[PDB]
Amino acid sequence: TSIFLQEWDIPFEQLEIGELIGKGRFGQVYHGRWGEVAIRLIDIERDNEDQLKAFKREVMAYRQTRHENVVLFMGACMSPPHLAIITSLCKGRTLYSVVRDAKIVLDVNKTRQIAQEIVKGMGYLHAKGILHKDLKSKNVFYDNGKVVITDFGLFSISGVLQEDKLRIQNGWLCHLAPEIIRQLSPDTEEDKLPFSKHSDVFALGTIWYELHAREWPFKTQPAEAIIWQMGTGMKPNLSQIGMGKEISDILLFCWAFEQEERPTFTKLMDMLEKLP
Amino acid sequence: ELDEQQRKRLEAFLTQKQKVGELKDDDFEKISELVVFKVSHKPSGLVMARKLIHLEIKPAIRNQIIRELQVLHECNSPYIVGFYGAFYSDGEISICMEHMDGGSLDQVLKKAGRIPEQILGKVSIAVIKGLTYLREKHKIMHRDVKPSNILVNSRGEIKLCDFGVSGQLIDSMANSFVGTRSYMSPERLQGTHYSVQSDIWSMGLSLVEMAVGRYPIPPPDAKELELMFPMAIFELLDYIVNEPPPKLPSAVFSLEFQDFVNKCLIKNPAERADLKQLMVHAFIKRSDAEEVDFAGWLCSTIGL
Numbered sequence: 035t036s037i038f039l040q041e042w043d044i045p046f047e048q049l050e051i052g053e054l055i056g057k058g059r060f061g062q063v064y065h066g067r068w069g070e071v072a073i074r075l076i077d078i079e080r081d082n083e084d085q086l087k088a089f090k091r092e093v094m095a096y097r098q099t100r101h102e103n104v105v106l107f108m109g110a111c112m113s114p115p116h117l118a119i120i121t122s123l124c125k126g127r128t129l130y131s132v133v134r135d136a137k138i139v140l141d142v143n144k145t146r147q148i149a150q151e152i153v154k155g156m157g158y159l160h161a162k163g164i165l166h167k168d169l170k171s172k173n174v175f176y177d178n179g180k181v182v183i184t185d186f187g188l189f190s191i192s193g194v195l196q197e198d199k200l201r202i203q204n205g206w207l208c209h210l211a212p213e214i215i216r217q218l219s220p221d222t223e224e225d226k227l228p229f230s231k232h233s234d235v236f237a238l239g240t241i242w243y244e245l246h247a248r249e250w251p252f253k254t255q256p257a258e259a260i261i262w263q264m265g266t267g268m269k270p271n272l273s274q275i276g277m278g279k280e281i282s283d284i285l286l287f288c289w290a291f292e293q294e295e296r297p298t299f300t301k302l303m304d305m306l307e308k309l310p
Numbered sequence: 311e312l313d314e315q316q317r318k319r320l321e322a323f324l325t326q327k328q329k330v331g332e333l334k335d336d337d338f339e340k341i342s343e344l345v346v347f348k349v350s351h352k353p354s355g356l357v358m359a360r361k362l363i364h365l366e367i368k369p370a371i372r373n374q375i376i377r378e379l380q381v382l383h384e385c386n387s388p389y390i391v392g393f394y395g396a397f398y399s400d401g402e403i404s405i406c407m408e409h410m411d412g413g414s415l416d417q418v419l420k421k422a423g424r425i426p427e428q429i430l431g432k433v434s435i436a437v438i439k440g441l442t443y444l445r446e447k448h449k450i451m452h453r454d455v456k457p458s459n460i461l462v463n464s465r466g467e468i469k470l471c472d473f474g475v476s477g478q479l480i481d482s483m484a485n486s487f488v489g490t491r492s493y494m495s496p497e498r499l500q501g502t503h504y505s506v507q508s509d510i511w512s513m514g515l516s517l518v519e520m521a522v523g524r525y526p527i528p529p530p531d532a533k534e535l536e537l538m539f540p541m542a543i544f545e546l547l548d549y550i551v552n553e554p555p556p557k558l559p560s561a562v563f564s565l566e567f568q569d570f571v572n573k574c575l576i577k578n579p580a581e582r583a584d585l586k587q588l589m590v591h592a593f594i595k596r597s598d599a600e601e602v603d604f605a606g607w608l609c610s611t612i613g614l
């Protein structure tokens with residue numbers, strides 16, 4: 035029923051909490067000092083035994099992770115209603131900001147390189163049987179070539195959807211593979227959507243689009259239009275900006291309508307190697 | 311496309327708007343919840359409705375929002391709710407507008423059982439006339455006409471609301487809400503080019519819901535229309551795109567009305583009736599020259 039900070043392999047004496055780094059839908063995330071760290075505070079029901087042990091399920095898993103392309107998970111302490119996830123602090127900016135910054139050039143060699151980093155991290159997490167469930171450019175950090183994946187697994191315990199009208203954030207729907215898109219309802223619950231390794235590969239496809247177009251797909255369209263277009267399998271390409279066939283074929287594969295036709299992260303890494 | 315009794319009220323509203331000067335938070339006292347709250351201006355004795363849209367973005371974009379929003383002072387019509395001003399306060403932009411004491415027809419339909427055909431004829435003239443004004447005098451389409459944004463009063467006007475005046479304010483919105491009642495046209499769902507025809511589809515669908523007392527997709531079986539007289543978002547929307555459109559029951563409504571909605575609910579927007587056609591449709595020619603005390607029906611059903 036409890037997770038204390040002495041259960042972890044990071045020797046911890048004191049934890050300072052500094053300013054809030056930013057707003058977000060799942061808890062609050064502050065600067066901290068341990069070196070410097072990022073502290074995400076979460077609120078739970080005093081006795082929601084269901085969700086408390088569900089949460090613990092996930093966090094012991096994270097204790098086994100260590101990989102250069104995944105943010106270093108450092109510890110989690112429980113005391114209801116207050117929970118904390120402590121990770122390493124990312125220097126630099128999110129990939130979201132970098133792509134949308136006009137002063138940074140993002141050539142095709144570099145986009146292939148960034149994409150390859152994200153895939154290595156994702157294949158590691160998959161190899162350890164951990165699904166991300168919220169892969170996206172606001173959850174990737176880039177500092178002069180170092181690329182780190184963050185916030186994996188959180189979505190299960192997230193509650194970012196929370197009468198009879200489902201809340202949809204800009205950017206969310208275009209990362210959701212069709213099998214998921216076809217099941218959203220105002221009764222939908224984060225812990226029961228049919229996420230899979232295949233849905234994670236789909237989400238990487240949206241990032242590849244975003245890397246080259248420097249904007250999300252379906253940028254123009256309202257949510258309902260996006261749901262129908264994506265649910266029936268209509269998808270953009272990159273020919274309108276002169277991207278070659280090879281850079282577009284990865285999208286055809288990652289966004290494939292039937293999941294089993296989408297590649298694992300291992301095969302996808304190979305496909306990215308073979309670009310010019 | 312001009313009347314006098316209507317002529318008296320428009321300047322009078324303009325005269326009222328003279329009162330406002332400028333707006334900010336402490337001028338206003340929360341009266342109730344309707345998100346939009348009915349509030350009382352103290353610098354000027356007006357009772358307005360003020361809607362609070364939560365946006366959190368740096369001022370250069372917010373200044374663009376308000377300049378684009380300032381055009382509503384200029385559109386003025388007996389078929390459009392009256393506008394007073396838009397300012398930003400404390401991470402929310404406020405739009406305060408004429409208050410309509412009857413609410414939305416969404417909200418009116420909840421209290422009534424179903425809305426009778428002759429009143430629905432009248433509301434059809436109001437809505438059709440509003441979009442035509444907007445299209446012809448401001449080159450704008452509404453982009454979301456449906457019952458919650460059409461407002462009615464005890465004085466008896468029916469006017470449109472919440473239309474797309476500022477391309478950027480829609481841009482600035484972080485997140486949208488999708489429930490199980492959609493009024494989006496088939497062509498908008500498919501992401502193809504669209505016009506005020508999309509508003510005409512939305513109007514047809516709203517009319518059938520109000521006439522039957524139920525959102526009509528999926529269509530009810532024989533059991534529930536008899537008594538009248540668990541669905542995922544994607545498959546509701548796909549119903550709109552691929553199944554044949556809803557229709558009024560053939561027994562209880564005049565042919566003119568049925569044909570009126572059927573012309574609104576044609577899937578191909580090029581074949582759907584456009585704005586002027588409906589002004590010449592048999593159904594609204596009949597309804598135009600009719601005597602219904604709309605104010606009377608309203609107050610009796612809602613209790614005022």
Ligand SMILES: Nc1ncnc2c1ncn2[C@@H]1O[C@H](COP(=O)(O)OP(=O)(O)NP(=O)(O)O)[C@@H](O)[C@H]1O
Pocket residue numbers: 055056057058059060061063072105121122123124125128172173184185203
């Ligand atoms: N490990 C980290 N290092 C540095 N900044 C971080 C870290 N994790 C999160 N942040 C920042 O903290 C803020 C809140 O992040 P978060 O709560 O994950 O929401 P988000 O990913 O930005 N978008 P969303 O999940 O859709 O609400 C953002 O400004 C993040 O960039």
Ligand SMILES: Nc1ncnc2c1ncn2[C@@H]1O[C@H](COP(=O)(O)OP(=O)(O)NP(=O)(O)O)[C@@H](O)[C@H]1O
Pocket residue numbers: 344345346359361407408409410411412413414415417458459461472
């Ligand atoms: N001027 C008004 N006078 C009276 N009631 C109003 C007015 N404007 C809005 N309402 C009511 O306020 C409630 C919420 O309306 P609103 O905040 O505009 O969102 P909504 O209509 O419910 N959904 P949406 O139309 O998509 O923005 C509804 O019950 C409306 O009927």
Ligand SMILES: O=C(c1ccc(F)c(F)c1Nc1ccc(I)cc1F)N1CC(O)([C@H]2CCCCN2)C1
Pocket residue numbers: 361382390391392393405407454471472473474475476477479480
């Ligand atoms: O409120 C608005 C709105 C949007 C844009 C804009 F520029 C406005 F000025 C707006 N309001 C407004 C306008 C004129 C008057 I006269 C009074 C008003 F309150 N809405 C658009 C809406 O339908 C949402 C929710 C449903 C999906 C589509 N966006 C509801």
Ligand SMILES: [Mg+2]
Pocket residue numbers: 172173185
């Ligand atoms: Mg995040």
Ligand SMILES: [Mg+2]
Pocket residue numbers: 458459472
């Ligand atoms: Mg509204």
